[PDB]
Symmetry: C3
């Protein structure tokens, strides 16, 4: 019995050491949670800025699109009237001679 | 007393089992921390590339802006001359006849 | 001995309260794991959308590049035609007089 007790006390001391080492994790789980929140903030930040960038790419693209469609057709008109002027000038120079 | 001991031994066996299961978190908390760091690497990277993309949507926009302003102008003055040449060909043809 | 036992029982009750307190962390470790996976999902999404935005900025840029090169070309030739038309309108007007 005195030996039962000695043994029993030993088992107990070994255990309270083990619980010593498990209380380290209270400190650690805590900082992890703090970080998951920080990482989460950062993600949301990034999700908005992709949204702002997305919005601008699709705008910049659409406005270029339509504007140049319209330049190409000044230049279209313009090249026609230039031909047709050069016709004229050929025929005026004929008539003088 | 002998009953006091038996009880005590039971409480102890139940405990060392409890502690077996809690030992399992030493792994989990360690995996999780490694991951918060990996997730944090990834974020910072995305953060940079949103920066590079932002920078371009701002540069691309500015260079388009100024180029087309200049072009629409060169077309404006080109179209002016042309109309005015069309005037001078009308009036020349009117003098020949 | 009876005092050894009383002590031993005390150490035990204190301990099981420890283990009460420490089973607190299980729900906290596994709400954190849930979250690391969520944050990890969200990263992967952001990563792709930066990819889609990147792809387009490079596209928008490349298409503008080449188009203006080609317009600036047509205008390079159109402006020649125009000089050379003003030449002949000068010379036509000098022949009429
Ligand atoms: Cl972006
Ligand atoms: Cl954790
Ligand atoms: Cl995270
Ligand atoms: Cl991200």
């Amino acid at each position: 019995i005195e030996d039962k007790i000695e043994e029993i006390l030993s088992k107990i001391y070994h255990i309270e050491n083990e619980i010593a080492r498990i209380k380290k994790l209270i400190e650690k789980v805590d900082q992890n949670t703090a970080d998951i929140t920080t990482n989460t903030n950062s993600i949301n930040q990034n999700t908005t800025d992709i949204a702002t960038n997305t919005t601008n790419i699709n705008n910049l693209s659409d406005s270029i699109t339509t504007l140049m469609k319209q330049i190409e057709d000044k230049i279209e008109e313009i090249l026609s009237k230039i031909y047709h002027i050069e016709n004229e000038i050929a025929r005026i120079k004929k008539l003088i001679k």
